XYZ file of C-alpha atoms in Angstrom:
330
model
C 188.956 34.960 43.015
C 190.892 32.735 45.452
C 193.613 32.651 47.643
C 195.709 29.886 48.943
C 198.301 30.422 52.043
C 200.433 28.323 54.039
C 200.122 29.005 57.843
C 202.757 27.871 60.502
C 203.940 27.671 63.833
C 205.699 29.859 65.383
C 207.517 27.805 68.135
C 207.635 23.727 68.791
C 204.271 24.275 70.764
C 202.190 25.059 68.202
C 201.653 28.458 70.708
C 200.340 29.987 67.544
C 200.434 30.437 63.602
C 201.670 32.400 61.324
C 200.597 33.606 57.470
C 202.541 35.656 55.289
C 200.594 38.428 53.451
C 201.010 41.286 51.506
C 201.056 45.137 52.142
C 201.268 47.957 50.187
C 202.879 49.155 46.914
C 205.871 47.574 46.377
C 204.680 44.711 48.377
C 205.744 44.780 52.306
C 205.482 40.965 53.383
C 204.821 40.879 57.218
C 203.734 37.791 58.665
C 200.119 37.948 60.485
C 198.302 36.229 63.206
C 195.306 34.905 61.470
C 192.329 35.512 64.303
C 188.798 34.227 63.988
C 187.787 35.431 67.301
C 189.110 39.508 66.212
C 188.363 41.252 63.327
C 191.373 43.781 63.463
C 193.991 43.420 60.994
C 196.823 45.715 63.289
C 200.747 45.769 62.554
C 203.225 46.457 63.909
C 205.167 49.758 61.950
C 207.119 52.149 61.312
C 205.092 54.505 64.215
C 204.861 52.364 66.596
C 206.717 53.279 70.065
C 210.694 52.329 69.329
C 210.692 50.332 72.855
C 208.308 48.124 71.828
C 209.263 46.937 68.448
C 212.137 43.606 68.645
C 213.040 42.097 66.103
C 209.093 42.122 64.040
C 208.963 43.218 60.776
C 207.165 46.747 60.355
C 204.703 48.107 57.766
C 206.361 51.739 56.278
C 203.282 53.217 55.237
C 205.479 55.849 53.730
C 207.337 53.615 51.089
C 204.002 52.250 50.324
C 202.641 54.315 46.583
C 199.105 53.089 47.378
C 198.724 53.931 51.223
C 196.168 56.545 52.350
C 195.672 57.869 56.075
C 192.180 56.946 56.730
C 191.496 60.289 58.077
C 190.562 60.477 61.982
C 190.766 56.907 62.262
C 191.454 55.087 65.496
C 191.670 51.755 66.870
C 192.190 49.722 70.061
C 191.916 46.510 70.808
C 191.956 43.545 73.989
C 192.006 40.564 74.320
C 191.055 37.659 76.340
C 194.751 36.591 77.020
C 194.885 40.459 78.391
C 197.286 42.004 75.479
C 196.477 44.887 73.960
C 197.630 47.672 70.881
C 196.424 50.551 69.428
C 197.150 53.805 66.983
C 195.821 54.787 63.193
C 194.745 53.857 60.374
C 195.852 53.495 56.176
C 193.854 52.091 53.653
C 196.606 49.834 51.384
C 196.491 47.181 48.757
C 196.027 43.389 51.055
C 196.900 39.957 49.378
C 196.731 36.700 51.135
C 198.149 33.467 48.780
C 196.825 35.590 45.456
C 193.640 37.483 46.873
C 194.126 40.888 46.476
C 191.559 43.016 48.474
C 192.014 47.257 47.116
C 191.537 49.751 49.886
C 191.379 47.159 53.248
C 191.723 49.499 56.778
C 195.603 48.371 58.119
C 195.338 49.490 61.672
C 199.260 51.002 62.019
C 200.153 50.101 66.404
C 201.676 53.457 67.508
C 201.299 51.270 71.033
C 201.842 47.669 71.659
C 201.683 45.628 74.848
C 204.381 43.589 76.254
C 203.706 40.736 75.319
C 203.483 41.464 71.286
C 206.835 42.850 71.534
C 208.057 39.811 73.752
C 207.172 37.564 71.031
C 209.610 38.774 67.360
C 208.043 36.152 64.863
C 204.337 38.042 65.123
C 203.650 41.346 62.885
C 200.432 41.793 63.562
C 197.378 40.262 63.618
C 194.430 39.489 60.608
C 190.908 38.938 61.882
C 188.862 36.922 60.905
C 185.766 36.980 63.383
C 182.726 39.574 61.474
C 183.192 42.884 61.043
C 180.883 44.266 63.956
C 183.637 43.259 66.170
C 186.455 45.918 64.412
C 187.072 48.055 67.088
C 188.320 51.482 64.339
C 186.211 54.583 65.177
C 184.544 56.674 63.906
C 183.860 54.578 61.055
C 184.138 51.189 61.701
C 185.795 49.234 59.241
C 185.700 45.785 57.441
C 187.628 42.827 57.329
C 189.856 41.552 54.952
C 187.109 38.414 54.429
C 184.329 40.523 54.216
C 186.066 43.084 51.820
C 187.111 39.538 49.606
C 183.884 38.135 49.873
C 181.956 39.327 46.825
C 184.787 38.559 44.728
C 185.334 35.215 46.102
C 184.362 31.963 43.952
C 182.134 31.398 46.801
C 182.040 33.260 50.119
C 184.156 30.794 52.219
C 187.550 30.965 54.377
C 188.835 27.358 55.474
C 191.328 26.286 58.096
C 193.411 23.509 57.975
C 195.897 24.288 60.792
C 199.066 21.472 61.544
C 200.039 19.335 64.759
C 203.814 20.559 64.928
C 204.014 21.055 61.111
C 202.706 23.917 58.519
C 198.468 24.105 56.849
C 197.154 25.951 54.869
C 194.396 28.788 55.016
C 192.461 29.040 51.522
C 190.371 31.897 50.397
C 186.895 31.224 48.413
C 187.030 27.365 47.915
C 187.010 24.173 49.580
C 189.578 21.874 48.911
C 187.997 18.947 48.966
C 191.205 16.752 48.882
C 192.552 18.616 52.109
C 189.941 16.117 54.452
C 188.719 12.447 54.991
C 185.242 11.568 54.964
C 182.287 14.603 55.048
C 182.444 17.573 55.632
C 179.932 18.588 58.775
C 177.951 21.823 58.461
C 176.504 23.492 61.724
C 174.307 26.810 62.960
C 176.612 29.886 64.153
C 175.554 32.576 66.237
C 176.829 36.347 65.242
C 175.117 37.702 68.068
C 178.458 37.983 69.781
C 180.214 38.835 67.021
C 182.044 35.545 66.930
C 182.004 31.952 64.543
C 179.847 31.228 67.903
C 178.387 26.824 67.685
C 177.279 24.301 70.204
C 179.458 21.518 70.232
C 176.658 18.070 70.640
C 179.071 16.342 73.165
C 182.397 14.366 74.682
C 183.857 11.760 74.806
C 187.752 11.320 77.232
C 190.059 8.574 75.951
C 188.039 5.596 75.021
C 185.069 6.198 76.786
C 181.767 6.816 75.804
C 180.382 9.540 74.947
C 177.861 12.157 76.555
C 175.974 14.342 74.656
C 175.580 17.906 75.952
C 175.471 21.232 74.370
C 178.341 22.633 74.700
C 178.653 26.228 73.090
C 181.776 27.998 72.229
C 183.434 29.521 69.428
C 186.092 28.381 66.682
C 189.151 30.736 67.650
C 191.977 30.589 65.473
C 194.157 33.393 67.371
C 193.300 31.165 70.732
C 195.968 28.351 71.439
C 194.257 26.020 73.435
C 191.302 24.830 74.339
C 188.860 26.355 76.928
C 185.406 24.198 78.252
C 183.606 23.467 81.017
C 185.201 23.038 84.433
C 182.819 19.578 84.504
C 184.344 18.551 80.938
C 188.160 19.320 81.690
C 187.701 18.024 85.237
C 186.625 14.827 83.339
C 189.469 14.421 81.174
C 192.373 15.408 84.059
C 191.224 12.541 85.783
C 191.691 10.193 83.865
C 195.724 11.544 83.745
C 197.744 10.372 86.884
C 198.797 13.112 88.608
C 197.280 15.795 87.126
C 195.838 18.815 89.333
C 195.036 22.312 88.753
C 197.460 24.111 89.856
C 196.249 28.030 91.414
C 200.271 29.230 91.061
C 200.647 27.520 87.324
C 197.133 29.395 86.015
C 195.920 25.926 85.353
C 195.827 21.812 84.852
C 199.544 20.034 84.763
C 200.252 17.050 84.574
C 203.792 14.404 84.790
C 205.457 14.797 81.875
C 205.705 11.073 82.136
C 202.355 10.644 81.563
C 200.526 9.500 77.624
C 197.608 11.835 77.365
C 194.290 10.606 76.104
C 192.121 11.388 73.576
C 189.446 14.484 74.035
C 186.360 13.612 71.194
C 184.306 16.717 70.432
C 180.850 16.570 68.435
C 179.708 18.286 65.654
C 175.968 17.238 65.050
C 176.699 13.594 64.840
C 180.350 14.047 63.376
C 183.340 13.649 66.178
C 186.417 15.402 65.780
C 189.305 13.236 67.858
C 192.099 15.305 69.137
C 195.140 13.058 69.961
C 196.133 13.258 73.336
C 199.167 14.225 72.018
C 197.993 17.551 70.576
C 197.472 18.157 74.328
C 200.623 18.054 75.813
C 201.931 21.746 75.498
C 205.318 20.562 77.739
C 207.551 22.135 80.881
C 205.856 24.911 82.748
C 209.699 25.793 82.498
C 212.763 24.295 80.938
C 213.545 21.176 82.446
C 210.348 20.696 84.559
C 209.174 17.992 85.046
C 205.842 19.270 85.717
C 204.082 19.698 81.929
C 201.270 22.044 80.962
C 198.022 21.029 79.618
C 196.037 21.754 76.635
C 192.803 21.887 77.701
C 191.804 24.329 79.981
C 188.369 25.453 82.515
C 186.833 28.811 80.679
C 185.502 29.017 84.201
C 187.092 32.490 84.459
C 186.500 33.512 80.858
C 183.336 33.862 80.055
C 183.695 31.420 76.853
C 183.930 28.349 75.781
C 187.145 28.720 73.007
C 187.651 25.746 70.272
C 190.740 27.536 70.553
C 194.191 25.535 68.137
C 193.806 22.592 70.192
C 190.560 21.609 68.877
C 190.591 23.386 65.120
C 194.167 21.747 64.292
C 192.213 18.453 64.245
C 189.779 18.617 62.075
C 189.045 20.495 58.463
C 187.302 23.405 58.954
C 185.286 25.399 57.161
C 183.889 29.361 57.589
C 180.978 29.440 55.432
C 179.846 33.192 55.643
C 176.901 32.847 52.986
C 174.210 35.336 54.002
C 173.110 32.910 57.074
C 176.694 31.486 57.949
C 177.313 28.510 59.075
C 181.188 26.479 60.140
C 181.718 23.007 58.863
C 184.404 20.277 60.544
C 185.457 17.584 58.681
C 188.457 14.478 59.700
C 191.748 14.586 58.086
C-alpha cells in the first residue's frame, strides 16, 4: 500500500504545517501537525477541557463505531517549546492520504497547554519519530508509520514541505518526480528515539564550505533551524545590524536586510536554504526588527534541522531495519 497527503502551512510564515487525517467510522477529519520529532498521535477531543478548546476540530470517539477505549492507558507529553498535553487513549481506524491503519492508538486530550488552545488551526499532532518515545502508559503504543510499515510497498515516508506553499507527505514510495538530482542517504542513530544524523558542514551565502560534523535531528515539528552558537554567529555576522536579543529570545535583524543563503552538508552533497526562508518577519506587528530563522541550539541540548532546513529539500525517512535519512534538492 501507499498513501499521499498534502500538507499546508498554517500561516504566512510557515510556522507549522497541517495535514488532514481521517479518524474513526464514519470518518472524522482532523488537521494534524506531522511531527518527526515525537511519537504520539494525539487529538483535541470531546474529552478536552472545554475552556482549553478555541476553534479546533475535535475527535468524538462516541460517534465512531470502530473506536474502543484502551482501558487503563494514559499519556502525557511535554515538548521542547514548553507546551504540553495529556489524556486517555482509544484505538480506532486512522487513514492518511488513502493509507489506512486499523487499531491505531489515538490519544485523546483531556488537557492541553495554552499554546495549543491559542492555535485554532492545529487539531493535534501525528508523531513520526521512533515508537520508543511514545508516552502511553503502562503499554507503550506504536506510531502510525510503525503500524503501517509492514503493509507499505517500501518502509519509508517522505517529507516535501513547501516554502509559503503546500507540500506533500508520502508513505510507502519515493516520488522520483518530486526532486532534482539524486538522493544522498546518511546514517541515523535511533539511540535517542529521533531521526538523528550528522551533517558534514555548512556555508554562509557564497562563502567557502566549512567541513565540520553537526549532529542533529530531522524534525518536521520544529519551525526553525537550531545549530551550534559558533555556526549561528557566523551566519548572522553577514547581516548588517543583526544581533542576538535576550529580550526577544534570539537573533533579530533589520527587516530591510536581504538575507544570505545557508548551505548544509549531507555527505558530499549540499542543500541550500535560500535567504528568504530565514526571514520570520517582524517580532511584533509593525516592528522593523525581524526574527531570524536560524537560531542557537545552545540552550536546547540538541541541534534541530527544523522546517527552515527541511523545506529546502526532499527528505526520505527510511524505516528499513537499519534506518537512514535521504536528502535531495528540489
